[PDB]
Symmetry: C2
Subunit: 377 residues, 2 copies
């Protein structure tokens, strides 16, 4: 409430991926110690942490060990079972709580929470079997999109239904997992806003980013987003409403659709630093990682001013060879690589923040490097 | 020339203090592994390193061990002896070389090198005995400063001569060590410039910083330095010429005196990241540490644009309690703490970068915190 976790103390992180690694690096600058729990040895985060606990996320015993050596605990792994987070908020210090994670983990529960906040979402229906899929298609028509309610993107995730010809594919998915069908709402661009709220209630919002996805993987984030001032203001206001209604502590990434007629629909939420906020490491006065640490520790939040326009480009497994071969050409580019040993095609290996006074020159730079030819097409 | 050290390789650092730690943090963002050699276990740098070697700086076997596991070797500790330096330069990869470091270890050698590069310094005389002191006093008159040529660490090691009354104290100093006598420069401001030069000869120069020393220890760096455009241009030009003439690879801090009459004299050089460049971590497009890594690894250098005005304030052992107590008042302030256990009174425990569009507001903020009343007086 007024509880402050002072520099020198230990922050425990559940999950050792790139998000935890970058949380850790930010915390280290401020003089915090870092403990991490991850199922695989020498994770990106372990490479920066003082203490490594190699164990499963459901390993209640190892979770207790993390709780014992930590003064505060946060998570970066978003598919963690919220029963484990319920244990921590009662027996350790987890200022984020378990509630928000539980609401944002399931696309259906997520939509209900956005609606209760009074914000606009695409019309949606829960799909648990073929009869329900049929009814949902009949009610919402085409175009629509079927998405699994919980984390299961690896190989499938979603089916876009442009016409009746895509129904066969949707039925297969509907059998494989619980789904929601959402009406496809026409939009000009996807945008996101990172909002941070500390234990003491202090709230900061980062600049609106314009996101470009390829095969449903983030390719580029563009800041400032190439949208109207009024859309930017609305996006920012929407993020503040969510932080307050969801009683946020820590970080919330709000992904959005911006339509040609100036409206914003809330797409999805992530209760953590998000890929679309990586630009902040090089372009803002505080990074989202530095902010997240400040939020949970209850330090004054840093400023979120955009200090230079930026295009973040993702480096997937398929790009890493190209990046390393082209290192000599990275003038004006700020490389971040996560220390993952095995490259797989779609695995996130790093990102590059391209800073320029002109956003179009930054975009042209990414194209000129030809590392992302596959994405450009 | 062409040699590039790619992300994924190991950077070895001789010296595990805060400069090593901040080098290592910048390197980790880019996906490098870190090895460190330091006389004390659990050093600031070891807290972020993948491999720690605990040994003396003059222990050639340990130095050799660090070199053997490192793809490139750099140093934070300057007083490496010649036998270790030659071994490193010829049998490891030490792109910085030994030549520049040799020149900057002796105040007389250093001033000769600066003059030979075509740059101005205060008039000076070598003092190896009492007779040479007498002659130098005669030629330079009062006021003047007698300084030891080596041993840059604590204990003053200097005597300011304003009258014949001070000669007695000076003779004692010249009796214990080789000295240099320098004519007193009537200066308005102390300033410094950080210059970067990569293995391939690419150069970048950081903005001029105004430095405020108290008890021979840096207190504040102010950027932009409160000096005329003409003085700024001159300091930058001088720093570039030095980098060229000394064939710098890596980082060079050039400390200077700026007079009211618009003249610059070169004071002293540090062939490494420097305390007067810590502001770059929060206020510049690239930090001196990010730049140092790029320079030795022969990556393209980042930009050095000042993105927001800044006051860096040092946190000594005598300040850490005040910082921790005032943590809730650190809005607009960016805290860096080095992870040192033992807090001696004059030991550098961290720094705070105070960012503000108005330099005077930043200065005011430092005072209003009432942490540095001692320095303020
Ligand atoms: Mg979600
Ligand atoms: Mg020096």
């Amino acid at each position: 409430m007024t509880r402050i976790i002072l520099p020198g103390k230990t922050i425990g992180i559940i999950g050792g991926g790139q998000l935890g690694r970058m949380m850790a690096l930010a915390a280290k600058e401020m003089g915090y110690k870092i403990a991490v729990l991850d199922p695989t040895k020498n994770s990106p985060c372990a490479q920066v942490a003082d203490i490594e606990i190699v164990a499963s996320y459901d390993d209640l015993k190892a979770i207790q060990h993390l709780a014992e050596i930590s003064d505060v605990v946060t998570y970066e792994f978003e598919n963690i079972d919220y029963r484990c987070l319920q244990w921590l908020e009662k027996h350790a210090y987890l200022p984020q709580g378990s509630q928000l994670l539980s609401k944002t983990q399931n696309r259906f529960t997520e939509k209900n929470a956005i609606e209760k906040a009074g914000l606009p979402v695409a019309t949606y229906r829960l799909v648990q079997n073929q009869e329900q899929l049929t009814e949902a298609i009949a009610e919402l028509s085409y175009p629509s999109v079927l998405k699994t309610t919980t984390g299961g993107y690896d190989g499938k995730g979603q089916v876009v239904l442009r016409s009746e010809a895509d129904v066969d594919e949707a039925r297969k998915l509907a059998n494989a997992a619980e789904c929601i069908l959402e009406k496809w709402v026409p939009f000009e661009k996807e945008v996101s806003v990172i909002v941070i709220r500390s234990v003491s209630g202090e709230t900061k919002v980062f600049p609106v980013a314009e996101n470009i996805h390829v095969n449903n993987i983030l390719h580029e984030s563009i800041v400032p987003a190439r949208i109207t001032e009024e859309l930017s203001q609305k996006a920012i206001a929407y993020a503040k409403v969510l932080a307050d209604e969801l009683e946020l502590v820590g970080t919330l990434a709000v992904e959005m659709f911006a339509t040609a007629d100036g409206e914003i629909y809330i797409n999805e939420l992530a209760p953590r630093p998000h890929n679309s906020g990586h630009y902040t490491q090089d372009a803002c006065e505080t990074s989202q990682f530095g902010q997240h640490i400040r939020a949970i520790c209850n330090l004054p939040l840093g400023e979120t001013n955009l200090l230079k326009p930026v295009v973040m480009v993702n480096i997937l497994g398929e790009h890493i060879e190209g990046v390393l071969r082209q290192v000599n050409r990275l003038t004006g580019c700020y490389l971040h690589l996560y220390g993952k040993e095995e490259a797989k095609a779609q695995r996130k290996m790093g990102h590059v923040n391209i800073l320029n006074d002109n956003i179009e020159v930054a975009l042209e730079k990414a194209k000129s490097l030809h590392i992302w030819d596959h994405q450009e097409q």
